[PDB]
Amino acid sequence: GFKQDIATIRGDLRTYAQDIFLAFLNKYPDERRYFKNYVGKSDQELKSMAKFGDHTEKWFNLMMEVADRATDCVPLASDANTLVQMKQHSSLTTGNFEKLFVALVEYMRASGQSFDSQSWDRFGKNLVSALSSAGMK
């Protein structure tokens, strides 16, 4: 289930984080505009950049904490507030998060690993609801 999936991801985090983030950027290439120096590069070029794996791991480290602090796939309001108020997220709207979770769920469904993808879809829905409640446009 969802709780065990958090442990699965955490056990191989850099690999999952990079592969899910790449699935996101490839499904939605114009999302690269929110980042520096990602356009014009293949997956392997991205993975060999100095900061790519590091920043995506820090991403997913926090995502897994948000998932872990949730009850029944409902994130804490304080975690949602942190995500809204982060300077690095000042250009974002809930649509960015929605697209990330569409890609995340798709990745999980296609994976060989028994992820509980329906729970991840619910968690994404609930996180987006929480971001809205916290004042993300």
Contact 80, 100 (CB under 8 A): no
Does residue 34 touch ligand HEM according to CB under 6 A? yes
Nearest residue to the partner ligand HEM, using Cβ: 55
Contact 92, 128 (CB under 8 A): no
What is the total count of residues that contact ligand HEM (CB under 6 A)?
17
What is the total count of residues that contact its own copies (CB under 8 A)?
7
Distance CA 74, CA 70 (A): 5
Give the pair of three-digit tokens for residue 91: 């250009």
What is the three-class DSSP state of 111?
Answer: coil
Does residue 18 touch ligand HEM according to CB under 6 A? no
Distance CA 54, CA 52 (A): 6
Q: Residues forming the annotated binding site for heme b?
A: 36, 38, 51, 55, 58, 88-89, 97
User: Least distance from C-beta 109 to ligand HEM, angstroms?
Assistant: 19
Residue ranges that bind ligand HEM, judged by CB under 6 A: 31, 34-35, 54-55, 58-59, 62-63, 66, 83, 88-89, 92, 96-97, 100
